[PDB]
Amino acid sequence: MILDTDYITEDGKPVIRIFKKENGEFKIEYDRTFEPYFYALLKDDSAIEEVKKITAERHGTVVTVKRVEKVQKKFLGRPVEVWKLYFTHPQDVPAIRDRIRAHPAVVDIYEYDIPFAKRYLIDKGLIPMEGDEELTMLAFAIATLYHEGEEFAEGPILMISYADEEGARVITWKNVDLPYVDVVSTEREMIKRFLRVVKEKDPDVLITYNGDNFDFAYLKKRCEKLGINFALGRDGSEPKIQRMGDRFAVEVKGRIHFDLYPVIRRTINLPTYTLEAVYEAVFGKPKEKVYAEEIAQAWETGEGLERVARYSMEDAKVTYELGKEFLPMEAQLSRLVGQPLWDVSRSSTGNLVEWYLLRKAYERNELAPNKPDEREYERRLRESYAGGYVKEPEKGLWENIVYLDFRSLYPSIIITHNVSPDTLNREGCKEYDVAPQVGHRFCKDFPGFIPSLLGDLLEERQKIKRKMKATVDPLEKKLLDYRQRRIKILASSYYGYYGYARARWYCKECAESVTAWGRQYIETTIREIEEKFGFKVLYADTDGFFATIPGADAETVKKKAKEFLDYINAKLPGLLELEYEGFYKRGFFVTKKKYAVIDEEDKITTGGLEIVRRGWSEIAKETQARVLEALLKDGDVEKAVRIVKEVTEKLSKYEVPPEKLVIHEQITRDLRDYKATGPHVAVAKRLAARGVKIRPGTVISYIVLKGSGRIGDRAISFDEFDPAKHKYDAEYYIENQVLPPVERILRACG
DNA sequence: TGCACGTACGCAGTTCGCG
DNA sequence: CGCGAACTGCG
Ligand SMILES: Nc1ncnc2c1ncn2[C@@H]1OC[C@H](OP(=O)(O)OP(=O)(O)OP(=O)(O)O)[C@H]1O
Ligand SMILES: [Cl-]
Ligand SMILES: [Mg+2]
DSSP, rough: OEEEEEEEETHHHHEEEEEEETTEEEEEEEEEOOOOEEEEESSSGGGGHHHTTEEEEEEEEEEOOOEEEEEEEEETTTEEEEEEEESSSHHHHHHHHHHHSSTTTEEESSSOOHHHHHHHHHHOOOOOOOOOOOOOEOOOOEEOOOOOOOOOOOEEEEEEEEETTTTEEEEEOOOOOEEEEEEOSHHHHHHHHHHHHHHOOOOEEEESSSTSSSSHHHHHHHHHHHHHOOOOSTSSOEEEEEEEEEEEEEEOSSEEEEHHHHHTTOOOOSOOOOOOHHHHHHHHHOOOOHHHEEEEEEEEOOOOOHHHHHHHHHHHHHHHHHHHHHHHHHHHHHHHHOOOOOHHTTTTTTHHHHHHHHHHHHHHHBOOOOOOHHHHHHHHEEEEHHHHHHOOOSEEEEEEEEEEEEEEEHHHHHHHHTTOOTTOOOOOOSSSETTTTOEEEOOOOOTTTTHHHHHHHHHHHHHHHHHHSOOOSSHHHHHHHHHHHHHHHHHHHHHHHHHHHHHOOOHHHHHHHHHHHHHHHHHHHHHHHHTOOOEEEEESSSEEEEOOOOOOOOHHHHHHHHHHHHHHHHHHHHTOOOEEEEEEEEEEEEEEEEEEEOOOOOOOEEEEEETTTTTTTTTHHHHHHHEEEEEEESHHHHHHHHHHHHHHHHHTTTTTTTGGGEEEEEEOOGGHHHHHHHHOHHEEEEEHHHTTTTTTTTTOOOOOOOSSSSSSTTTSSSSOTTTTTTOOHHHIIIIIIHEEEEEHHHHHHH
16 A cells, blocks of 8 residues: 655655555655656757757756657647656756746746656556555644743643554653553653654554644654654654645654644534534534643642643544544545545645546646646636526425425536536537537537546445445444535535636636536526426525425425426436435525525524524524524414523623633634734734734634724633623624524514 | 645625725 | 625535
């Protein structure tokens, strides 16, 4: 099984290293035969003699073209002649590629920014995480104090906990009387003892929770401060903190640092992504949290450290347990894209698609299009196109509602109509499909590039859903639900990639064709079910709609909808198909993207309401839920009013826990780049001045204090909140949090 | 190491600025 | 003192 690749330099020449686990043994393979290269499109073949003359420099040594070879390839499925330009070292490519492109005889250059080690995985056709090998995993976490004004790594690590299949232990240099705590003398010994533990256990995988920016980065930053040779790599090297543009990431040669945090970010949508919140969401059990205030007190007083040692142990314990569940799903994703788990587990979804596209392109001798420069990137960001069809919903309460939904609409459209950049307005074909409204044409004589890849993803999603019905255990069902959602996000990201300004295979024409087809399919389907079947469509969005036969009983609507399904599915071509997605007794639709229905089991599912949205306090989420209960279940408009007025009286008497009072909101950019400053940004700008690092992705949890003026002026983070000292704004939570969400359900006056 | 900068659109709703 | 911009996050 391939674990990762990198390269080292030997006698000025690159040497690929292939880290593998084969038959339960770690191994490094060496390849000194791979030459860095990129392509050049020349106006005339005779110019190759001038192109060979172009030189450049890096750190004193001159960079030359080592060798050239004229190859025949395809660009968007059309034959093209280009020159393969070879070079001695990978670092030569960034130094000379610009000067090579600007030559007047060079039309363009291609595939000039592929990292050497990942270029190797594609060209030689290796797939990481392939094969039947069991990987050993070891989680760890550190406990570290931080005063107001302390810099990075200036504080000592108090505790280093770790966990695997054999249990969990804590290492510390203060005496704690616990059978899973090993008390050493100093911090250096504790760090050295941890180094010995990992070398002894020799895990293939090191699991952390946001260790890229905290635990692993701190531990290494401390090892440089005390002068500890933290030889963690299996090649005898130290963990290396890697600059990843805005963020940093920790790599350990020969192992795999699995940082669960970025994985969890793009799998589960949570209000906050603390280790405690993630554990409860995944395993359905709560996890107590010990805050830096109690760790500072227990460290200073010397009492209650057993409570802290327990917290530290559980950090590593739940990190192993979470890592145990999410590593195989990330491994399968690594197998598809054909890139190492270390990279795949930290990549954006757009990057995963492109790397897979790059591999597939090489497989078919297709020259890759280049990423856009700064100007073309700005142009694509400025252009857009029409999206999903949305219908203003029918107001009032409706009964016997059926929800009909298209199955993987956008991928189905891409496959069925062969929407791809190599098929768009392609001349010389005998059959075309014409995109409605926009009029783009797509060749159908051969499977298009992206359409030829989407089928397997859809089949992979249905197989997981098949297992979901055969799943008895509720935990395996939840994890399967995660997996099929990740595939659905990935498959639909192929459509979105077409509109991604940074995409190599950018295709605005493809993206607006998919939506146009999606609009025509859902709109004509609505017309058909209404005019031919007497249904009344209550609410419709991009690929699905709610409908009913007004006045007909539950069974009648239920069977006419099934009859309608067979009727249009025989009319729809290719992979397009409507699904019977669910039946609901009653329901109503407040506005676009906001609704709530109740099923035959009296379970109330909602869409787009404040119940699921981040930014609304829990007492606001709770009050809307109970009002929806009194409406959709009991049908008591007056009961919901009594719930609201009673909750508002709880707020005025300060009878509410400040826990139900927290507002969560995320930063989406650099704090210096915010034009306007909202409450979560005003708070975030404060913690930025207090030393707490805030970056795109940080979730602020604040409470609004009693005052008059801007909300951001009286906002305070939940950490520093003291219920005895601080008094929240009772009027704000009544009038701005609790009341508007329930008011907007104004079927009756209020 | 020299890659990543985070798949798309349509839209409800809040804070804030300022007239 | 109503509204437009800035912003977040839903489906
Ligand atoms: N994150 C997304 N990015 C781009 N397009 C998307 C996304 N989510 C949905 N779409 C597209 O928007 C329309 C449609 O929404 P469904 O949420 O219904 O996802 P399927 O339809 O794919 O699959 P199912 O019905 O669950 O089998 C989907 O094609
Ligand atoms: Cl060799
Ligand atoms: Mg669908």
